Amino acid sequence: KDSLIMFLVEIFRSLFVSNCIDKNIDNVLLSIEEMFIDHYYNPQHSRLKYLIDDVGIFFTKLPITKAFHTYNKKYRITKRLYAPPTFNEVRHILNLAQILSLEEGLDLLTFDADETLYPDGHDFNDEVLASYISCLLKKMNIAIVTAASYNNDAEKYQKRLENLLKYFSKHNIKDGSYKNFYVMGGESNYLFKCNEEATLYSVPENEWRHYKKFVDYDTVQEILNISEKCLEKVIKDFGLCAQIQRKEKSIGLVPNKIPSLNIKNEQKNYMIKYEVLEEAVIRIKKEIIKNKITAPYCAFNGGQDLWVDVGNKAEGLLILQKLLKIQKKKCCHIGDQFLHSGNDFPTRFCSLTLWVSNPQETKACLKSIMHLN
Amino acid sequence: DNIEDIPLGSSEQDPYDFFTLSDRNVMNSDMKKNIVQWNSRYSYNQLKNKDSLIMFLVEIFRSLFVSNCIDKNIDNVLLSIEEMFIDHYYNPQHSRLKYLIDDVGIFFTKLPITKAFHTYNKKYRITKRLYAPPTFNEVRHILNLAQILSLEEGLDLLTFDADETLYPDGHDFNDEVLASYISCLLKKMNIAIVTAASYNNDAEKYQKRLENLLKYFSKHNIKDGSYKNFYVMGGESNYLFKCNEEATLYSVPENEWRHYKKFVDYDTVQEILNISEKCLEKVIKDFGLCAQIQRKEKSIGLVPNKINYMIKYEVLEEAVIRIKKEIIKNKITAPYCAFNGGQDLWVDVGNKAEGLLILQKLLKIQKKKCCHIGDQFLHSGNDFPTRFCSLTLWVSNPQETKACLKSIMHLN
Amino acid sequence: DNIEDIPLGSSEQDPYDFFTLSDRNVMNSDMKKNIVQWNSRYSYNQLKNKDSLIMFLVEIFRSLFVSNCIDKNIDNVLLSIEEMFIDHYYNPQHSRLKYLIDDVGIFFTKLPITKAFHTYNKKYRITKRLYAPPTFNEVRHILNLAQILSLEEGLDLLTFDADETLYPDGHDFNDEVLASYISCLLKKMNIAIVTAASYNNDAEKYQKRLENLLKYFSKHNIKDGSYKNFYVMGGESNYLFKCNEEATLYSVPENEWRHYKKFVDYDTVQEILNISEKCLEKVIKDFGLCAQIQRKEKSIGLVPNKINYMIKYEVLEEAVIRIKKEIIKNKITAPYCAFNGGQDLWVDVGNKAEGLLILQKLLKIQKKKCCHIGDQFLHSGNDFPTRFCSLTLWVSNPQETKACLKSIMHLN
Amino acid sequence: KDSLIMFLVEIFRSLFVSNCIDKNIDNVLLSIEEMFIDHYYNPQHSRLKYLIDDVGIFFTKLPITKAFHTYNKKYRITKRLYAPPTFNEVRHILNLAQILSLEEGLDLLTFDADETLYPDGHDFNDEVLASYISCLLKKMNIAIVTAASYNNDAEKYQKRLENLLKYFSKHNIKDGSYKNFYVMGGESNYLFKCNEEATLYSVPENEWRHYKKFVDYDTVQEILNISEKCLEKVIKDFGLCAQIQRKEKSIGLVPNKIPSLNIKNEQKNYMIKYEVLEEAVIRIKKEIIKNKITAPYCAFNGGQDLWVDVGNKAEGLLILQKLLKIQKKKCCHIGDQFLHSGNDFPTRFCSLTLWVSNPQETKACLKSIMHLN
């Protein structure tokens, strides 16, 4: 799951079953906060490292006590006699705590666009969410990391973000704010910026090529050929109706449309069992590790088709960090961890990370970002 | 055979959920739901509680897979499990399968679980997976296949949990392809619809949700008198409707079916609603909720206010347990159902198991010839006991309901 | 208040143990027993089943320790737990503590758990441990301290599970230091001994095990008539003996105490023994065991043959469950106890909870003024319900029994 | 616990609940055996490595199927309708499987003397067990690893093994078998052999010094001083009545005798809570790791007193292996894993290891060693 959330959940459970969760529990909260701050400083030798081995690194001193006190007044979770705090609520607590930790401020806010901004299969379609990103764009750089691989063609990427770009053109671009907006395609392969006319344009590759570690063209082609052989073997033994699609630095297994239960004349994408997709992801990672590949890559499920890309969203996050000359403490990222189950590419060590189950919680977290100043 | 002797425990609580997998607000698309079932710590206890028999088979197949022998001749293990299943069919009480699992229920047919496994495996080749063992969704598909293949003789009654399968996300019936399967099945066998919605005795309100479906019924079914076999049940076991010549529901006279339902002195009914109303009012005050209470004749509910204002899922669970505890505190033995919906809370003085038995006794159908289409993710086990009333099939989405009904259509 | 309404479930089974921590053959010295309690996967489910209330406190203190606040002012958590304990003392049925734990039982005294924690911590400084949280053995010591400190008014009855505490490894009583504590306590309060051994109505055989203890009784206690308060109970609740002028046991007349025990038609008693004897004979044949069956008037047992030939512990567990299942198959409702000893198997048509209540009613003692010294590792929960009859203390070895009795000696 | 045992236990449980455990289950057993042999060959890339990460290395092809079939006829564990196979029984199965795996034979048999041979606090006192070691001594070298630290004084070590040495003198030493017997004191610090007169004598340190990796005298003294400071701090805050005892290369915390509950005039060793001893072991390991000590050492509980020695029983096992010029496949060790809870010194990778809860199971395992030839 996520060992840190389970740590706080189990503590709150045991505090609840003692029938003292609604009294003054500041001694427990302050002790947990002092332990969290003691992991902020001297992280490798903190006591939290022994209690939880996969804490990672904390880049800010979060006020978990003040965050709990603030959230509890809003939802009154301590008043419930029969329902103790849940996994979802503790996730909300740590989200508010991470926002409150950034007292000095941040300059880079990144969104895993596949997970939070647009609902998969459609374009940006949230007028209120565009307004929150709008006012925040003025104060800080906002970057968008998207897994779509359209090479460096900015028109295809604009089709998904057209509504937000139209909002930019109407209200943001007036006072030079528009320069702060950045978009990252592929995983770390294509970069796009915004212009005065509110239209996406690809940044020259030579400007940001030096920041990223080079990956040999022979090595990536080796990766795609391995993935092609595995996907072909997986289609053969499961008798699937899918095909392998190869991009410049991307390869995926996409289902073929077939006539289905709709009578006479209609189509539906061939449903591939989610279990078969996970089996394929494990086979691909097993074969890639067998060939001793050090180059970073990401093989993810993400819906009904499987895709293997070179580079990970963490690499694009660190690219934007090093390019904009921002320290790691002053940048945060909004992304959903339910979609990436096994991780191995989680950015908990690259930048601050927020967990937001649906676009409505994104509005709530972005409202808190507005209130922070 | 009777609701009085059937085990309910309406005022019990399933062990608490900290991960809130039932929260269909956070879980959104089916992709995120399927991720958590792979991780055992995320969903184990919640899962097995919904259907322990399936989990029992998951553990056997898991050990078969990790022994690296799941793809060899495993017919000895499967035949042994089938032999336990048949021995539980012949002698359900005090069987050995009953000893292993207390809540296994009753089997009404000889389950050919071996053939169901061989056929399901041959179609999807799930045994070829070297790194992913068979998951919970696939063994529940096998149990569906085993129950369909078991049902060799035929059916007379088909029942649908209408809130779960027929209505998309609370909307009205809007699946024309599904109507064709339902119409062809009504021609051959009786079709019963049980829905938790309580619209008093207003037949037009119940028809409004089934308006699209009844249009297909009037187009093709009205020709051969199959419409008489169609029945709808309101409340949970409180109101009964049949179909007339036109595509409109007409209420069955109360005197015709009154005796089949277990008697409730009615004074207790409104005592239940008064306790629930006081608890919900206190819950609204305590959490400052923006909601309204809708009270029916024998039903009461807590519904969010129109913008819909969001009610915290955990507050809904808190209020359900408060109502059950306060109902115990007044020592009320009447069978009822207080369930936690996605956005709404509802307390009904009926149970869908009670209405299923009422439909069985009215139509004078034996239990072997009765089946039920229902999703076991949403309904708690204490409110509706699984496989105690009839054969039970599990369907997660309208597509699997289509496939099950198509397979039932080609029966024998 | 009565054995008839008390919850037994004599024919139930505790969830199976794969690690066999109860196997005192493999576990040998107390060092190896203490190792496994630190690992949660080794002993969790088995432990909590023996005393869930203690485990409930372990989880709270575990979360307090991992919060790195167990050594700060934790009096708010402890006072809240104490407030739940007192609320469970006033209203045990339907209390909130009863909601958290179903098998908590009844409290007969206001537990000062806060003071018991503060005193136990101040003596051993268990809160100073930075890497090891408080274990199960230390919280069960605190519960012992909380129950002794709770008992403020005083005692009239003291009961010993003789098989567990008095006899060393099945030998006769051979602890002269313990006799002094027992003698001083008899002077002030009545002392009752319940032992599972069944020697028919032979008072000399029961005395042979207590011969060393009765020598001390005759030396110091006989002077002040305290010997009259001493009572011994054979079988499990079948035979009763008192003390006479000399250091010899004399049987209490049956007519004096017959009515207190729940009636058994006796014909069922021998039906139970016949079922058990047939099951044990089949078990001996099936596993080729070298053992003998000893049948008493109202007791029957399976005992290893003299060289002692070793009987596999798991075969003993298998035979216990076989006997319970076959007893159910004949639908026998009489309260009995079939327990799995270390080397022997025994089926008694009595229960130590039934005999404890018989001693309570005979001496006309209120439950608040009754206590029991017993080890909860050996006795299963279904046979002897914990804290349903009187206050219960947990003792692992003769040394802790000495310390508890010394603390009881200085009471008020 | 021990992940491998749990693997077999859970499989046997699921086989039992299917009500097929008494039928022909050779397909499951042979598949598990083939998987075990496939981890014997190419161990780093075996499928067992993925299913169980801590399998370690297997030095022989064990016949787990034949071992189960042999054991089942003896105890009829498949006939039990209500009790599935336990942790103890599966441990017995793997013991028999490891014995049967040594078809070619072994030349070195080692006993953790603290755990199996003598019951703690007493000397060797098993006439029948001495007979089994007697006949086995002729065919193979038998070594004894004991944690007692008496320097290189052979008289103190003979006091614990006097009964077995007397058995050696009467029946073994007649035909030159006595030369095979070896004893290892400390952990890997003192070595003893047997002579014609059946009396222990210390082997010269220079003969076997080269095989063991050298540990600086400054480093071991650093270890003992750290342990002395920790034990002193532990005695101070718990108010214990114990004292620190320092040997050449050993240091321990030993309880002080105090007058106890026995009236007037008697003594008893001060009881130290087992929880305090575990807390001290963790503190000592934490401080030693903080000072970056690479030298092998062992800090164990083992009763009522705590002892910290330099070197581990694994080092003595490998010393005797390299000294006697024996391949790892032809040597086994009999020791109990209940006493060493957290391990970190388990010899599952050094040699074959048997698990034997009491001296009676040692007699049973040594009878099987007799039957192997």
Author numbering:
A (entry chain B), D (entry chain B): 59 to 431
B (entry chain A), C (entry chain A): 10 to 316, 327 to 431
Sentences from the paper on this structure:
Each subunit consists of four domains: an “N-Terminal Regulatory Domain” (NTRD, M1 to K59), an “OD” (D60 to T143), a HAD-like Catalytic Domain (CD, F144 to K270 and K371 to Q444) and a C2 cap domain13 (K271 to N370).
In the presence of ATP at pH 8, the activity was highly reduced. The structure of PfISN1-ΔC10 displays a PfISN1-ATP-bound like conformation (RMSD = 0.36 Å) confirming the role of LoopL430-Q444 as activity regulator. Upon mutation of H150 to V, PfISN1H150V-ΔC10 is no longer inhibited by ATP and PfISN1H150V-Apo is not activated by ATP.
